[PDB]
PDB file of C-alpha atoms and ligand atoms in Angstrom:
ATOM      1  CA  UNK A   1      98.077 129.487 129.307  1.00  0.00           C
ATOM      2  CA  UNK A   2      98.604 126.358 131.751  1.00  0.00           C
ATOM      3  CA  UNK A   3     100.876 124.075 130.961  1.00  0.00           C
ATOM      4  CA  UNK A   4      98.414 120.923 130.876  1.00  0.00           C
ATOM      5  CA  UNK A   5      96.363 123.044 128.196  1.00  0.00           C
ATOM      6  CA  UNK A   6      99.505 123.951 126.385  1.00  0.00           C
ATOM      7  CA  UNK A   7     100.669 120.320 126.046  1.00  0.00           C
ATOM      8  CA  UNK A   8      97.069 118.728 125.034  1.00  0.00           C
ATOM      9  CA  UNK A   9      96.950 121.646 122.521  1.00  0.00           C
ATOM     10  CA  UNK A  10      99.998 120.745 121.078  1.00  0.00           C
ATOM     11  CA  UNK A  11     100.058 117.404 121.357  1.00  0.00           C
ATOM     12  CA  UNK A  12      96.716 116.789 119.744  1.00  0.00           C
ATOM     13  CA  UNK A  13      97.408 116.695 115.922  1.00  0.00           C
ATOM     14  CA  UNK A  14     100.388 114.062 116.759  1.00  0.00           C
ATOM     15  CA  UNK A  15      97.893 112.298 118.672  1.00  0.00           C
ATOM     16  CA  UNK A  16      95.674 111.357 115.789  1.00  0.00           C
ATOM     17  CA  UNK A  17      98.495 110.538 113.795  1.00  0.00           C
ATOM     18  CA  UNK A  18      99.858 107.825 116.812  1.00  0.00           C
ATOM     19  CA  UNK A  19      96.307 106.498 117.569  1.00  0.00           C
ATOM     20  CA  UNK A  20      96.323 105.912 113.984  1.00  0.00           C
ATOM     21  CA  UNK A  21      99.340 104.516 113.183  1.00  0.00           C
ATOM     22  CA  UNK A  22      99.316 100.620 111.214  1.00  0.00           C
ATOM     23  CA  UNK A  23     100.104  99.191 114.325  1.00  0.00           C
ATOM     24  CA  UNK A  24      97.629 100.799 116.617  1.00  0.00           C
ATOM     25  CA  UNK A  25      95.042 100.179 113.520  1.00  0.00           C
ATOM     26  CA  UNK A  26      95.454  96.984 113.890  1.00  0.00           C
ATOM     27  CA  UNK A  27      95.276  96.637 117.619  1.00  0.00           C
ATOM     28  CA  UNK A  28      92.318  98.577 117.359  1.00  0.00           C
ATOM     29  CA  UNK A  29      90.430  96.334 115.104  1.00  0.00           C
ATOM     30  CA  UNK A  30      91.485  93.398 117.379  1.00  0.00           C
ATOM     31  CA  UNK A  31      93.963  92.300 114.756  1.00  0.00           C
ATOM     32  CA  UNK A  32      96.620  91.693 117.244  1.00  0.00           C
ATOM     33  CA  UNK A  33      98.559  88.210 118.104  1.00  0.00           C
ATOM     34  CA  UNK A  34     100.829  87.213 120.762  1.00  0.00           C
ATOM     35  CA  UNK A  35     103.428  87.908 118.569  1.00  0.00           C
ATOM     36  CA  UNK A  36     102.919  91.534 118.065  1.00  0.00           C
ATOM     37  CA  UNK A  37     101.719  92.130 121.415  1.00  0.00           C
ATOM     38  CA  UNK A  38     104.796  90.317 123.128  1.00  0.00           C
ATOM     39  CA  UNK A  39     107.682  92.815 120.826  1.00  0.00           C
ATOM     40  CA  UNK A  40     105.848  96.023 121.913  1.00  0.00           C
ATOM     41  CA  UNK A  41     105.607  95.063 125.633  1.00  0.00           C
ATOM     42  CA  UNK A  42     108.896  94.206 125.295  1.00  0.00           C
ATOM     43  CA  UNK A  43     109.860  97.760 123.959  1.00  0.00           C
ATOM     44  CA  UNK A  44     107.809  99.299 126.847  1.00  0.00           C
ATOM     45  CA  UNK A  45     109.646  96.898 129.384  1.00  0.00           C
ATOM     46  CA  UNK A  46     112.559  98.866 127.971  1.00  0.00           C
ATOM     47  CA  UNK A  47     111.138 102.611 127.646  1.00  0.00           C
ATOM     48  CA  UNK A  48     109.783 102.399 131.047  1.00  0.00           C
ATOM     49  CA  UNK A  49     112.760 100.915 132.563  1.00  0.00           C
ATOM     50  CA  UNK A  50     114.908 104.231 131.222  1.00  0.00           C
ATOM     51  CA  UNK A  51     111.930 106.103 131.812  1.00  0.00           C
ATOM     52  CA  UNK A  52     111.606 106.037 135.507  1.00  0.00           C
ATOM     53  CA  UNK A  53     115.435 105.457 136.032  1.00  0.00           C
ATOM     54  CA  UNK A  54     115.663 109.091 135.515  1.00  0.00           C
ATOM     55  CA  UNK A  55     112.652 110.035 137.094  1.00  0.00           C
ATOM     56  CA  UNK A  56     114.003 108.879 140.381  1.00  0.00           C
ATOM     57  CA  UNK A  57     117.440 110.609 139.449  1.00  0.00           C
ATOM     58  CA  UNK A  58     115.299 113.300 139.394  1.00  0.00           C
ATOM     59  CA  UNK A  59     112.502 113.026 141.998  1.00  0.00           C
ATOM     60  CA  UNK A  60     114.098 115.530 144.335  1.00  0.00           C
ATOM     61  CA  UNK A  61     114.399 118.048 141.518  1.00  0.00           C
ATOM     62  CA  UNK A  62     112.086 121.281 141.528  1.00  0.00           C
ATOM     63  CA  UNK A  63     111.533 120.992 137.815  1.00  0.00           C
ATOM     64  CA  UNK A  64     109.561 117.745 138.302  1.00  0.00           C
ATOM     65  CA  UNK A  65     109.191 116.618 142.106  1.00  0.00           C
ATOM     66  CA  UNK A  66     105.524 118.125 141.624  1.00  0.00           C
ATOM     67  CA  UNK A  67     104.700 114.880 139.540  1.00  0.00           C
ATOM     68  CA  UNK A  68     106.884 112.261 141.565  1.00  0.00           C
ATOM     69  CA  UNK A  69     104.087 109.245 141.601  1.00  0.00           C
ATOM     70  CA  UNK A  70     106.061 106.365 141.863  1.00  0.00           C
ATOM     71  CA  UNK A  71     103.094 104.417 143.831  1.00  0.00           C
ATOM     72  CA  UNK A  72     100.457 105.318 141.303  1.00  0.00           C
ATOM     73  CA  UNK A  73     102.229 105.324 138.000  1.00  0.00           C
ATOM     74  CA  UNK A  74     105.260 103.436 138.056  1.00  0.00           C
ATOM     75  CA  UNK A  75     104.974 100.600 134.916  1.00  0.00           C
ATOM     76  CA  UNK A  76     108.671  99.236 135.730  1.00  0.00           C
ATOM     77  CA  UNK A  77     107.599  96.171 138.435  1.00  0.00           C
ATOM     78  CA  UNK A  78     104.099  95.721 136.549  1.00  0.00           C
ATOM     79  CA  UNK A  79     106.228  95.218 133.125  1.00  0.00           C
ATOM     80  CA  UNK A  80     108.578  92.960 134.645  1.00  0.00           C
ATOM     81  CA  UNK A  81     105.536  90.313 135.410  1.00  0.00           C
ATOM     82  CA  UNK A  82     104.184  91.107 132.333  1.00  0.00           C
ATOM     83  CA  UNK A  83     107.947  89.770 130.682  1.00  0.00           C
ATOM     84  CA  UNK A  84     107.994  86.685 132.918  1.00  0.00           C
ATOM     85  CA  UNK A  85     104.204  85.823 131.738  1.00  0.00           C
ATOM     86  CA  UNK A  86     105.209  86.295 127.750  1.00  0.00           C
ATOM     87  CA  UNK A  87     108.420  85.302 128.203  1.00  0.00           C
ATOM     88  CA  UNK A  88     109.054  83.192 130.507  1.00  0.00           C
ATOM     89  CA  UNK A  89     111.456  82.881 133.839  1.00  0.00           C
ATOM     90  CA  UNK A  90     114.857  83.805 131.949  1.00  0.00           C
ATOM     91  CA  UNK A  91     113.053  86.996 129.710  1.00  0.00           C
ATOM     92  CA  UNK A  92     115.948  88.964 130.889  1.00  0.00           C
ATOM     93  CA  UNK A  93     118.317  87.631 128.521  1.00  0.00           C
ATOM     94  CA  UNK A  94     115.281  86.295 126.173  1.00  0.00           C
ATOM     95  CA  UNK A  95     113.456  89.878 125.247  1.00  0.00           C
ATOM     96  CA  UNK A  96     114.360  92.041 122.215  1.00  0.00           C
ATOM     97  CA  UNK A  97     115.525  95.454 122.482  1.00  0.00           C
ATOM     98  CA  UNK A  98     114.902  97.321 118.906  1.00  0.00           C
ATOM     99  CA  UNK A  99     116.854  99.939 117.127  1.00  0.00           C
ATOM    100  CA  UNK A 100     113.799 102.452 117.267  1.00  0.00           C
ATOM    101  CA  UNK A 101     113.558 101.333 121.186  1.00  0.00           C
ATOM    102  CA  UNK A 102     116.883 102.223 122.198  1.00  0.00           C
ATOM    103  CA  UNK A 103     116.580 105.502 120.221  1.00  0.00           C
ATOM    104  CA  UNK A 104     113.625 106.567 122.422  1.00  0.00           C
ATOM    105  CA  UNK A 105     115.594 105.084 125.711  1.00  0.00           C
ATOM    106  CA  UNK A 106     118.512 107.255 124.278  1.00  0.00           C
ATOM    107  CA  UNK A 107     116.725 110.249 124.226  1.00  0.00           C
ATOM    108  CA  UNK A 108     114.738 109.270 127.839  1.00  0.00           C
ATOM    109  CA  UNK A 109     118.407 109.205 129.461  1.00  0.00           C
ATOM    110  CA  UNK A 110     119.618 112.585 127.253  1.00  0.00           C
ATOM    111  CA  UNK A 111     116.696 114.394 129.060  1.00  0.00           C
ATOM    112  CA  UNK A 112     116.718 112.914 132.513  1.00  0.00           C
ATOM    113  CA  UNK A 113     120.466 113.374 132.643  1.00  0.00           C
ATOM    114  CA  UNK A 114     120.810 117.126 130.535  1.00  0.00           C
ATOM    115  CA  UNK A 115     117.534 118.252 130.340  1.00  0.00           C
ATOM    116  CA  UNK A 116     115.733 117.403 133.283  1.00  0.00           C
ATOM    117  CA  UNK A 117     113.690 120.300 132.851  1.00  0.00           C
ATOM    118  CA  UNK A 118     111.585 118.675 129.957  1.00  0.00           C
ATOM    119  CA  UNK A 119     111.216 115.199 131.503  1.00  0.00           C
ATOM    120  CA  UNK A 120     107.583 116.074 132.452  1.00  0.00           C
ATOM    121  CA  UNK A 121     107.128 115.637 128.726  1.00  0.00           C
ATOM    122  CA  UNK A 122     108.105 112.202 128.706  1.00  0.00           C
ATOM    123  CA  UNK A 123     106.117 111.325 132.058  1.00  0.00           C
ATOM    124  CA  UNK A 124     103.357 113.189 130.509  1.00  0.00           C
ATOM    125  CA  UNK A 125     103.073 111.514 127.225  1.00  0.00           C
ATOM    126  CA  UNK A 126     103.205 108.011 128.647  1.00  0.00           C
ATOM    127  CA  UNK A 127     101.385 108.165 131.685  1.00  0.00           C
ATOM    128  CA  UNK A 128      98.634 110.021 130.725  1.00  0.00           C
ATOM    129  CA  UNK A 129      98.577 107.713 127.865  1.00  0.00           C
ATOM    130  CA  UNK A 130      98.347 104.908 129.634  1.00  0.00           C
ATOM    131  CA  UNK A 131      95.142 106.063 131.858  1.00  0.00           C
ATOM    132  CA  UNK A 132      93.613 106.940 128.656  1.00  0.00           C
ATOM    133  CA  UNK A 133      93.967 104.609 125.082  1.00  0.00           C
ATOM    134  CA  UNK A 134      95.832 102.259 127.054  1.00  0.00           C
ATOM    135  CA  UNK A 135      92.706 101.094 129.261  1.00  0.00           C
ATOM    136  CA  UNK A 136      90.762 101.052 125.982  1.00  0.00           C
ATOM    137  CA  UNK A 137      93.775  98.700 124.389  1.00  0.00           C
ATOM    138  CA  UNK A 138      93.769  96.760 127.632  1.00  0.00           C
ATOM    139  CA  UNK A 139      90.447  95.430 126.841  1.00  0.00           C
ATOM    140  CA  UNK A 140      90.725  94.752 123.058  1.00  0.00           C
ATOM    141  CA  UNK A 141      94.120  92.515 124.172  1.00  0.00           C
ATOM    142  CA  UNK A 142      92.041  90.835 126.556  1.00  0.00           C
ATOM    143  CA  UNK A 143      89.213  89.749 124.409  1.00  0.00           C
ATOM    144  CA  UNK A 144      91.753  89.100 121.217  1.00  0.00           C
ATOM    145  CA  UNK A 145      93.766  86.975 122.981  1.00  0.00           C
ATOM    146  CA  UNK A 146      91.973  85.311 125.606  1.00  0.00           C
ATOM    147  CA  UNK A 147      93.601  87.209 128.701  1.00  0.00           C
ATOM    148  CA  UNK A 148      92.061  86.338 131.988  1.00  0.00           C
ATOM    149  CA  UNK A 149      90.070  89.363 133.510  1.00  0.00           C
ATOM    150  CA  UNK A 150      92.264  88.363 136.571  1.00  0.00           C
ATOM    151  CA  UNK A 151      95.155  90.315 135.175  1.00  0.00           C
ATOM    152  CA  UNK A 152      98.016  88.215 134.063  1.00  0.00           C
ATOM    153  CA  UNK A 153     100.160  88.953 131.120  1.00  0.00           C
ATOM    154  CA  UNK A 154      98.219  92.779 131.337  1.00  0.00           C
ATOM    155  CA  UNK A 155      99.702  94.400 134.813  1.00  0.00           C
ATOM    156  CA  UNK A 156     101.332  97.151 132.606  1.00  0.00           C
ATOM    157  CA  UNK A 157      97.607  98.368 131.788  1.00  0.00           C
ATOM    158  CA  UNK A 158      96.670  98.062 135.688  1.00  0.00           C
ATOM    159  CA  UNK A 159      97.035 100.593 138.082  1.00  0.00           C
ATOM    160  CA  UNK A 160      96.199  98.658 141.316  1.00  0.00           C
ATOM    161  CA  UNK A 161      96.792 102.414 143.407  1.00  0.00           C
ATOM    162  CA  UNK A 162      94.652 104.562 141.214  1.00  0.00           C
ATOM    163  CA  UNK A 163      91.083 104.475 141.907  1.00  0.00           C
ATOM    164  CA  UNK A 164      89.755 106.051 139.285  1.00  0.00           C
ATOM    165  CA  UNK A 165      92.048 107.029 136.267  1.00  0.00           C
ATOM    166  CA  UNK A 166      89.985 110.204 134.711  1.00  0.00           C
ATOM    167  CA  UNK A 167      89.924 111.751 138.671  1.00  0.00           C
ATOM    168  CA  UNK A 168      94.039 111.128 139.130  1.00  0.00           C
ATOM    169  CA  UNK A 169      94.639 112.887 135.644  1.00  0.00           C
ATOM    170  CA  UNK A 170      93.303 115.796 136.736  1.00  0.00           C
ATOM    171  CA  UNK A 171      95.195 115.606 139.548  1.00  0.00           C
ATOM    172  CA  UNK A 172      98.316 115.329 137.461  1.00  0.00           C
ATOM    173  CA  UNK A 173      97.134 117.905 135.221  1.00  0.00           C
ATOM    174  CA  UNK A 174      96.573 120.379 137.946  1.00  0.00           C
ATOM    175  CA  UNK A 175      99.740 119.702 139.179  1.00  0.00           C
ATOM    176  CA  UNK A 176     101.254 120.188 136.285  1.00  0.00           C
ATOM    177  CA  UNK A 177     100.415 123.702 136.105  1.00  0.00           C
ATOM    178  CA  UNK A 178     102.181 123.928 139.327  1.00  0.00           C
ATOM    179  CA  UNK A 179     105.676 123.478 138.019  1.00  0.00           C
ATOM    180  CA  UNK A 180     107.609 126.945 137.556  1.00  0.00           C
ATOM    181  CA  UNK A 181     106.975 127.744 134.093  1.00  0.00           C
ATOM    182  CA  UNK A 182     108.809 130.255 132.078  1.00  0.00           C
ATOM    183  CA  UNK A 183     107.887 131.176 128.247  1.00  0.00           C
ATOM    184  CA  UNK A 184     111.147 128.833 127.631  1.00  0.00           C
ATOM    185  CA  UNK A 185     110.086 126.057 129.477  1.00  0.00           C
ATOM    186  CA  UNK A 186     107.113 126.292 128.527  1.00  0.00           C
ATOM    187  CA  UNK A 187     108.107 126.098 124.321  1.00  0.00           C
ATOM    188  CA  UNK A 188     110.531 123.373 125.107  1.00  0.00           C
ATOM    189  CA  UNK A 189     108.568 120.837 127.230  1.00  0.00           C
ATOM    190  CA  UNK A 190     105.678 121.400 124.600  1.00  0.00           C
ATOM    191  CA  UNK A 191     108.218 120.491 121.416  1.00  0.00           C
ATOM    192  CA  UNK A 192     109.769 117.727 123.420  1.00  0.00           C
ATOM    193  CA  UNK A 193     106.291 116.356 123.850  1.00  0.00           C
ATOM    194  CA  UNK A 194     105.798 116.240 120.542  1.00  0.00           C
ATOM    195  CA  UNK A 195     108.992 114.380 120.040  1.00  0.00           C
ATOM    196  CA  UNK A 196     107.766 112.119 122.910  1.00  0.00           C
ATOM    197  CA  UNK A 197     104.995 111.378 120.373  1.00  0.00           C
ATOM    198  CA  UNK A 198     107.179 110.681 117.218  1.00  0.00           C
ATOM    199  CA  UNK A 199     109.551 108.293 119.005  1.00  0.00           C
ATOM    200  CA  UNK A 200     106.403 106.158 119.975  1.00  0.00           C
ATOM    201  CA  UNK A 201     104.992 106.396 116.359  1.00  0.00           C
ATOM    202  CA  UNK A 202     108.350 105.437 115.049  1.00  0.00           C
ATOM    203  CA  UNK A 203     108.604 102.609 117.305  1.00  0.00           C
ATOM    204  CA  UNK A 204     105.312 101.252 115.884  1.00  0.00           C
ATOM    205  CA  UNK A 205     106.488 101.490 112.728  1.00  0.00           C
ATOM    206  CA  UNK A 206     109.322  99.219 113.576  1.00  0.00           C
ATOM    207  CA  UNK A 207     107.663  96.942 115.158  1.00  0.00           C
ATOM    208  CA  UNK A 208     105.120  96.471 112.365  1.00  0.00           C
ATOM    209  CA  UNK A 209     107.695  95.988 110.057  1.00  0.00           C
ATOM    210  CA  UNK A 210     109.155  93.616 111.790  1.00  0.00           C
ATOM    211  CA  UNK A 211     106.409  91.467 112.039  1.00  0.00           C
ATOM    212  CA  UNK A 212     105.815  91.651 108.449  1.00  0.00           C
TER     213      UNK A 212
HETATM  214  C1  HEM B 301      95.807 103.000 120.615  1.00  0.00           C
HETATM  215  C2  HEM B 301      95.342 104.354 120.041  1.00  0.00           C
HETATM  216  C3  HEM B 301      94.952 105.352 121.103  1.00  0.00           C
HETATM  217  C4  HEM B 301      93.721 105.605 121.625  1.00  0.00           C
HETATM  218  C5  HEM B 301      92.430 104.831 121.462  1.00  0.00           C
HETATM  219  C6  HEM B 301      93.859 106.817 122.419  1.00  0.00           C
HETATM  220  C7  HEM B 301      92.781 107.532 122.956  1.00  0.00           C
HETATM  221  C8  HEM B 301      92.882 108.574 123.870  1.00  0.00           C
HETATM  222  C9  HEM B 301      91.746 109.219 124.543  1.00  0.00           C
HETATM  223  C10 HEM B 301      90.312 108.784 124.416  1.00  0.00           C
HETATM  224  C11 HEM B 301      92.265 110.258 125.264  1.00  0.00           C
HETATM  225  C12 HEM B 301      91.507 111.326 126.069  1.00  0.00           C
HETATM  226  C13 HEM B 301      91.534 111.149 127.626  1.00  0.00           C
HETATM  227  C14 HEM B 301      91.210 112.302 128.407  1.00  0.00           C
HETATM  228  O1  HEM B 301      90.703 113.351 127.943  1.00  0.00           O
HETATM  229  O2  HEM B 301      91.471 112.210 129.677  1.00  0.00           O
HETATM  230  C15 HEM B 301      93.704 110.182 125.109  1.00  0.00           C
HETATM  231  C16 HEM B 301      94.620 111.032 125.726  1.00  0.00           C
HETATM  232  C17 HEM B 301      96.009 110.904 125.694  1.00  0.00           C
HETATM  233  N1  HEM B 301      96.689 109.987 124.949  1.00  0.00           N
HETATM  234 FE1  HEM B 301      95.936 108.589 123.744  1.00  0.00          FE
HETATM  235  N2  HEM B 301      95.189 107.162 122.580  1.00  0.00           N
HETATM  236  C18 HEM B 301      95.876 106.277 121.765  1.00  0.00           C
HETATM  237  C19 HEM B 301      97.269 106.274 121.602  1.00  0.00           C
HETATM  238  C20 HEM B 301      98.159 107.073 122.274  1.00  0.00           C
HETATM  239  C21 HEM B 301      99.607 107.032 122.109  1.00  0.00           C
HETATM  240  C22 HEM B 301     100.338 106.116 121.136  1.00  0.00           C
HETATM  241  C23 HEM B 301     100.097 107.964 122.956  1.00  0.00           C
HETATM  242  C24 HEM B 301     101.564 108.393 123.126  1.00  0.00           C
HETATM  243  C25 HEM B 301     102.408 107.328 123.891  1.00  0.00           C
HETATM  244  C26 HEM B 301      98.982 108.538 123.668  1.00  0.00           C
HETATM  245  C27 HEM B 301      99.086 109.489 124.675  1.00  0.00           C
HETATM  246  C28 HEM B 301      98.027 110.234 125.208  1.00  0.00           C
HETATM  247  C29 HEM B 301      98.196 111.365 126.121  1.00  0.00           C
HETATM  248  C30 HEM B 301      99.534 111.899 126.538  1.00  0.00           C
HETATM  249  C31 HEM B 301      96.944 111.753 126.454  1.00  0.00           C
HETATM  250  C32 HEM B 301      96.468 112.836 127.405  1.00  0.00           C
HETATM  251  C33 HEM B 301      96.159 114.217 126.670  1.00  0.00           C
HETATM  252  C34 HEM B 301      95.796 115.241 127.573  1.00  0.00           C
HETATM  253  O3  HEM B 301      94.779 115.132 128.314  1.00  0.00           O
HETATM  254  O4  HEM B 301      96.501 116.294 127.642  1.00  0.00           O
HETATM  255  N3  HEM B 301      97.786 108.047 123.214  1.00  0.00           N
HETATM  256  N4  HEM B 301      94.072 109.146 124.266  1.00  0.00           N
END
């Protein structure tokens, strides 16, 4: 079995439960205020940051070279506009970083620096993500709060290099299954992706407490 097919299969069931989460409920129904949308762009700002810190600590290692698309995927830059928009031109020392945030950037650095073998997990889960529900989300932000269709305060949902999103996951899905897979690498990078999953629904569980 491929290891694209392997993740989506095991993935799946966590999916539902993340696309359903309160938070992502709400989004969905357009119930979603600057507020809101300002702590979890925040949190990504963070997640990413971590994220693709050990991606290029990595990007010359056989275990995950293969999906080294720092042109095409790469959220850090677009987040850091998107925290100057919300934030302002000090958001460095103005944004939040949450408990259930640095848990997730804890366990992005764990990987990238011990266990570099399962950060295609982590790439996987929010990348793919992001070409998928996130374009979807990008829209319902845009008409719930009045975003211009010129892009400000949304780069994080644009991917200026990617033509066309459904064509480039194939790509990365194909590519995937290029990686040298063993039957433990295989069972590992499919649990950590499923851990990959939890840390985001726990962060939007935080994050919707906190706003009530
Ligand atoms: C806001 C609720 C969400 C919606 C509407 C949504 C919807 C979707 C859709 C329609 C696909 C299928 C795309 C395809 O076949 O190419 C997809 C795939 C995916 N989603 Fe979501 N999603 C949501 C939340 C999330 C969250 C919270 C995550 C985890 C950060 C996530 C990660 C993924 C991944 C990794 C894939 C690719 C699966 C695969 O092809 O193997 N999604 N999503």
């Amino acid at each position: 079995q491929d290891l694209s097919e392997a993740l989506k299969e095991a993935t799946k069931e966590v999916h539902i439960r993340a696309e359903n989460s309160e938070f992502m409920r709400n989004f969905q129904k357009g119930q979603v205020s600057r507020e809101g949308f300002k702590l979890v762009m925040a949190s990504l700002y963070h997640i990413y940051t971590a994220l693709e810190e050990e991606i290029e600590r990595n990007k010359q290692n056989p275990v995950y070279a293969p999906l080294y698309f720092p042109e095409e995927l790469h959220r850090r830059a677009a987040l850091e506009q998107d925290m100057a928009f919300w934030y302002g031109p000090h958001w460095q020392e103005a944004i939040p970083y949450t408990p259930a945030t640095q848990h997730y950037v804890k366990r992005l650095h764990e990987v990238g620096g011990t266990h570099p073998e399962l950060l295609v997990a982590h790439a996987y889960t929010r990348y793919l993500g992001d070409l998928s529900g996130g374009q979807v989300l990008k829209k319902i932000a845009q008409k719930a709060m009045a975003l211009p269709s010129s892009g400000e305060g949304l780069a994080f949902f644009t991917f200026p290099s990617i033509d066309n999103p459904t064509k480039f996951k194939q790509l990365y899905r194909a590519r995937m299954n290029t990686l040298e897979m063993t039957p433990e690498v295989k069972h590992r990078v499919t649990e950590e992706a499923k851990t990959a999953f939890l840390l985001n629904i726990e962060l939007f569980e935080e994050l919707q407490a906190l706003l009530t």
